[PDB]
Design an enzyme around this catalytic site. Structure first.
Site, PDB file in Angstrom:
ATOM      1  N   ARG A   1       0.796  -1.073  -0.125  1.00 39.08           N
ATOM      2  CA  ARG A   1      -0.231  -0.128   0.018  1.00 39.08           C
ATOM      3  C   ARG A   1       0.910   1.382   0.007  1.00 39.08           C
ATOM      4  NH1 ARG A   1      -3.405  -2.524   3.992  1.00 39.08           N
ATOM      5  NH2 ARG A   1      -3.195  -0.809   5.470  1.00 39.08           N
TER       6      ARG A   1
ATOM      7  N   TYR B   1       0.633   4.494  -2.571  1.00 40.62           N
ATOM      8  CA  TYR B   1       0.570   5.778  -1.766  1.00 40.62           C
ATOM      9  C   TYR B   1       1.413   6.797  -2.549  1.00 40.62           C
ATOM     10  CZ  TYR B   1      -2.417   3.239   1.646  1.00 40.62           C
ATOM     11  OH  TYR B   1      -3.295   2.565   2.375  1.00 40.62           O
TER      12      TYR B   1
ATOM     13  N   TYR C   1     -12.676   9.844  -0.406  1.00 38.65           N
ATOM     14  CA  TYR C   1     -13.883   9.582   0.173  1.00 38.65           C
ATOM     15  C   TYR C   1     -13.830  10.086   1.671  1.00 38.65           C
ATOM     16  CZ  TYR C   1     -12.773   5.174   2.213  1.00 38.65           C
ATOM     17  OH  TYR C   1     -12.343   3.970   2.850  1.00 38.65           O
TER      18      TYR C   1
END
Ligand code: SAM
Ligand code: SAM
Lengths: 393, 393
Positions: free
Chosen positions: B66, B70, B92
């Site tokens: 991840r 990023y 979001y």
């Protein structure tokens, strides 16, 4: 079935712009609006959106117990609910974050059998994260009301964020239109000295209330808060942020049980992910472009969307109806009352789109709006959205 | 002065409706939009508002760290900033609440001398307060990432709210499109048992992502989380709320120093303000209409606005310009560049309104939009808005 509803909404902190689209739509649809906001442009904006508004702020008074004001504010709303009206209450920020009368009115409405809902809004703490450039996840966040913090001796963590609301009215239960004489502010500063030390930073934070203003983000030492000229700057819209004093080490047993078990040099407790918290004292410089970062960036040139990525594949008719359900409370009520009747009267939907709306199931709608690859559904399970945008350590 | 800017905004949690008006306006004004959202209706909505959008979600991949994702997400945004474009990133919820790449990209942009700002949004925690009917102020709130909570042995307070994000990916640093195999979930449950006991409640919370859905607000005991059928319901959009076990007593020294000093029967630690937290175990029934409440309500009949209350007294021209500054980023930029030039070209402003805009001072604008009574300014001080809507104890 029973006539009358209460929807409580927020305006956010910064004038007008921080109102959510749904807060606006409910304000417009309401039979009656009751509001409590700080800035006059937001007040003026609300009055252009509904013809039947009442300012709740007029129920404060000098030397009048805030509890009596809150009972009255609540009762004004619930009275109109009992008459069978769709009532909207409006509070600045998030209407359930450090707000008494919203929770009271909703609870009463719900207990008497009326529809009752709070819509979330942007709080002063949300603004704080954005303006101070911190994430509550790194390294956790403790949030208190400043008087409660003192009166109940609430715990601090020197390894996590600390946020204190209402630092400008320490120990004050009443109200005055000309503001609070915050003469017990020194009691707060004593507690902060005990917990953090006299030279630890405290950020005086005030979010911009008008769109052209900059936020107040003034760093002081705990000791500096005792200086009268600094103490007087703290008012009714002041919040304090106190950064961590140190980084907490990892628990070996948990490292083992979570199988993060190349344990040798699992990044040392000070091996921070860029960027570091700039408010934290003696925070080292963190390299944004390490070799691993540079290698990740080099892979962008040859990047293609993964096999299992689901591209959007919808239609104007479907996006139009999903937008209408979000932005038109009346349409939403109609849809919720009879999915099939509503779905069958939506113009230009495909058969799949119509069927998805008839069911209302989250997954059916997602399936109608996104192309799910065969690669995905061979592995995938018969909700799983999976969008996780932070990684600790 | 330097060309290029980065504004990172949120969409809120519930599809479309929880986007703020300013988030929408910046998305519309942007040269380039990069987005990472969960639901397809929000994605479709964004694509109707700007012609140059890129989905950041395609930079995740199966077994791909991840952190690498990023770095790439951040770099895609900052590259466009460096070209001199006004770039908007969209995440979001609140884009800085449990989000790595937003903070990274903003920090890089700022360090290289570009305009950089995060606009706050409605987080999953904001939704939690609204849907679970709790206020972080009563009795304080501790918020952690679930893996971090375990790995750094973060403290709980049995007397305050506890909120845990990312409980569906305990100990997982990579990604899979079909979701996480949350096989270390038992480690979390062990910690919760140690801290709270096996029969203490844990609320599994999932905010509605579509406007017609109800939230998941399922109460379980800590022990019940060990049952496989219950554990499997926890996914990538699951958050836990753990209510307090007891009420904390008051500190006598602080009662004295704050002069709350009719100390005899200062409401006992269990003498709650209505309404009580419904999730807290063995919470007593609290009377909403006590004699004091009934007396406050009886005063409504004879109520008049207090002397020092400041009624709104503005004009359409002024409300129009204040709305434009909030909803039109280009107009705001023009105003910020030259207050006087901007103010002098606004049609139909009164002299006071024009003068207030020329200065830009918060108080001058408030003074132009509200009638300040002589009673107020005889007592008032030469900002003091004063809108405090919660009272502890
Ligand atoms: C009664 S509470 C209401 C909070 C509001 N509902 C919210 O969502 O933030 C008032 C407290 O909120 C905080 N607050 C309000 N406006 C603020 C601003 N512009 N900047 C920072 N904090 C603010 C202060 O701590 C203040 O004493
Ligand atoms: C990567 S974070 C991002 C959070 C987001 N930026 C926000 O403002 O809430 C993801 C975590 O947010 C929480 N979350 C996301 N969607 C949610 C929902 N619909 N209901 C409850 N929690 C949610 C979950 O704890 C999830 O594991």
């Amino acid at each position: 079935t029973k006539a009358g509803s209460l929807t409580i909404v927020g305006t956010g902190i910064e004038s007008i712009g921080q109102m959510t689209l749904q807060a606006l739509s409910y304000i417009e649809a309401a039979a009656k609006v009751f509001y409590c906001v700080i800035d006059p442009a937001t007040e003026a904006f609300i009055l252009t959106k509904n013809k039947n508004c009442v300012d709740l702020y007029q129920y404060y008074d000098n030397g009048k117990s805030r509890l009596n004001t809150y009972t009255q504010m609540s009762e004004l709303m619930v009275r109109e609910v009992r008459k069978g009206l769709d009532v909207v209450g409006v509070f600045y920020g998030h209407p359930g974050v450090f707000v008494n009368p919203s929770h009271r009115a909703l609870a009463i409405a719900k207990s008497e059998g009326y529809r009752a809902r709070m819509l979330p809004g942007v709080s002063a703490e949300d603004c704080l994260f954005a303006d101070l450039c911190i994430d509550p996840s790194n390294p956790g966040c403790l949030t208190y009301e400043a008087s409660d913090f003192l009166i109940r001796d609430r715990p601090v963590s020197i390894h996590s964020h600390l946020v204190l609301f209402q630092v400008g009215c320490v120990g004050i239960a009443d109200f005055n239109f000309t503001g609070f004489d915050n003469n017990k502010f020194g009691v707060l500063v004593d507690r902060l000295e005990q917990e953090y030390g006299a030279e630890h930073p405290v950020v005086h934070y005030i979010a911009a209330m008008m769109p052209h203003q900059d936020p107040v983000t003034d760093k002081y030492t705990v000791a500096q808060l005792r200086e009268p000229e600094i103490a007087k700057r703290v008012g009714g819209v002041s919040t304090f942020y106190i950064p961590p004093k140190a980084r907490k080490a990892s628990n070996l047993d948990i490292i083992r049980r979570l199988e993060l078990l190349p344990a040798g040099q699992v990044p040392d407790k000070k091996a921070r992910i860029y960027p570091a918290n700039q408010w934290e004292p003696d925070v080292p410089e963190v390299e944004p472009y390490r070799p691993s970062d540079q290698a990740a960036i080099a892979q962008l040139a040859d990047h293609a969307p993964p096999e299992q990525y689901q591209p959007l594949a919808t239609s104007k008719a479907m996006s139009d109806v999903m937008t209408k359900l979000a932005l038109d409370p009346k349409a939403l009520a109609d849809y919720k009352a009879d999915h099939r009747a509503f779905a069958q009267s939506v113009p230009d939907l495909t058969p799949q789109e119509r069927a998805a709306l008839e069911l209302g199931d989250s997954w059916a709608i997602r399936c109608a709006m996104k192309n799910m690859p065969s690669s995905l559904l061979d592995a995938a399970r018969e909700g799983f959205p999976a969008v996780i945008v932070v990684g600790v350590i």
